[PDB]
Design a protein around this ligand. Structure first.
Ligand SMILES: Cc1ccncc1NS(=O)(=O)c1cccc(Cl)c1
Ligand SMILES: Cc1ccncc1NS(=O)(=O)c1cccc(Cl)c1
Lengths: 304, 304
């Protein structure tokens, strides 16, 4: 037992990290097969980032201007193209460490691991959630751009995120691996608003099931509620409205614990209305929303 | 910016995980050079674990009784020996994925990454702290024994922990890679008490420096304190007493922020005496003690 904010083993992704340099800007790239994916803002200078015309900036660049280095070996760039906000550098050598992979566009509320990298070198791995407002609360410094978010299903790596920028508010924004931003963000140094973020209700409930499984049951009460009643409370506390789809995915956890989903909703309702009264749940003094029902099942059963 | 409970990239350690089977018991092993390290309780049955005589149990075992599998290839065991609570299985092939490594015995309050494994297969990575009482609050299920804790310095993996057991209280206990238990624990299914755990004061203070660096400064106040005065408060709240050595290691963070260590102690003092009043620090509603001053500096500078 015990419950931790666990990230996926990062090994398959470490073997794909490279350094991409263009002019004076260096960031991270992802080498899969004979293609290196990186944020297109690698072609910008500090002055360009205020209002960049990427098509025009890319026209001044040739294959030889993109310096791609994997560890200590230089890769030969034979093609370059822009796809939305990513650059695809065609290299002459396939990465021998290319794992089985997919590019997937995740949904808000879903979680993933981030392998934070600097100069093509991995520094740490942590588990994140794509906030309902399409931002991530990561840990990213200068040089971290091009770091990727992913999930792993047995031997298949599903890349879902590529880090592009930090909003003036300190939250992070990025794209899927086809270069499409999650949210309304653009790759430009301008004031950009991330909407009102809400708490992922289905994840908090799954984490409440994880607490019961692991012994923390103080929050369990003699009450029940309805989806409509619970959602009145969820609205007041900026929680995502709970739907029958969320109840359905909570099915396995409800089955394993024997606590009906709506009864767990009444425990969450009382926690929202009365707080924790100084107590903790799974070592946390607040309601945790970065564990999906899938994460809880995987962790609670030991899925490798 | 942003601050996350980051684990080390696990790739170097994934390449060392193997499955070790002896009789009906299967657990994880660590293959470094031509040696496989695993918990010695792999030789026990369920009845043996109540009061095992490991010397006697090992005498009934031969090299051919230890089944070591790396992925899908079987390793040939040519030697076996017990060193404290670990078994060292000499195999005929050196692991080609052996990274540069050290075996180190960490101090309580220090942190490390755990690569939780089942059947020799990695499932997730998370950052832990060796509690002052020599336990870890991990996430370990049946089959997780043999999972290791480690730190990484550029290309050198310092293994510090090997998971052995879960105490009836739900906390975890294990050994260094020479088989010596951290704490007073023995590898036996008996009631064992982990002492009174305390909060790692130097880590909370380093995490308070990480909060200031990242924008969270509400807790900063117009007060200062002395080491002796602060320690009176630390005693009352089960915090480890702060020493000049802890103040010295906080030096770099004190220098970078311009907030004297004793002034940060007065912020911590007020937080202990008055709580958080419903507020958070780095997204947490409690005082975090699993980031050492080294972790904070590394994360806040991007050390790969
Ligand atoms: C100064 C610079 C030069 C070139 N390329 C990037 C940067 N800066 S940055 O990465 O912090 C950045 C700022 C604003 C928006 C975005 Cl998408 C990225
Ligand atoms: C049932 C069994 C059989 C063989 N080897 C281990 C186990 N059980 S166990 O790993 O949960 C365990 C229980 C108590 C102390 C320790 Cl150190 C480990």
């Amino acid at each position: 037992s015990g419950f931790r904010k666990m990230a996926f083993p990062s090994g398959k992704v470490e073997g794909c990290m490279v350094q991409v340099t263009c002019g004076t800007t260096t960031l991270n790239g992802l080498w899969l097969d004979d293609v290196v994916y990186c944020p297109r803002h690698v072609i910008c200078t500090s002055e360009d980032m205020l209002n960049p015309n990427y098509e025009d900036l890319l026209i001044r660049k040739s294959n030889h201007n993109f310096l791609v280095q994997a560890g200590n070996v230089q890769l030969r760039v034979i093609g370059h193209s822009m796809q939305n906000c990513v650059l695809k550098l065609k290299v002459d050598t396939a990465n021998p460490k290319t794992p089985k992979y997919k590019f997937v566009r995740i949904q808000p509320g879903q979680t993933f691991s981030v392998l934070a990298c600097y100069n093509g070198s991995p520094s740490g791995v942590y588990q994140c959630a794509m906030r309902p407002n399409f931002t991530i609360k990561g840990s990213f410094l200068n040089g971290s751009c091009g770091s990727v978010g992913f999930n792993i299903d047995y031997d298949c790596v599903s890349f879902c995120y590529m880090h592009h920028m930090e909003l003036p508010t300190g939250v992070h924004a990025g794209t899927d691996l086809e270069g499409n931003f999650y949210g309304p963000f653009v790759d430009r140094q301008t004031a950009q608003a991330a909407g009102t973020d809400t708490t992922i209700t289905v994840n908090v409930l799954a984490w409440l099931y994880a607490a019961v499984i692991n012994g923390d049951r103080w929050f369990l009460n003699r009450f029940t509620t309805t989806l409509n009643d619970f959602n009145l409370v969820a609205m007041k506390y900026n929680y995502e409205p709970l739907t029958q789809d969320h109840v359905d995915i909570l099915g396995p956890l409800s089955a394993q614990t024997g606590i009906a989903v709506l009864d767990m909703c009444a425990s969450l309702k009382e926690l929202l209305q009365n707080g924790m009264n100084g107590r903790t749940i799974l070592g946390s003094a607040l309601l945790e929303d970065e564990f999906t029902p899938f994460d809880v099942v995987r962790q609670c059963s030991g899925v490798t």
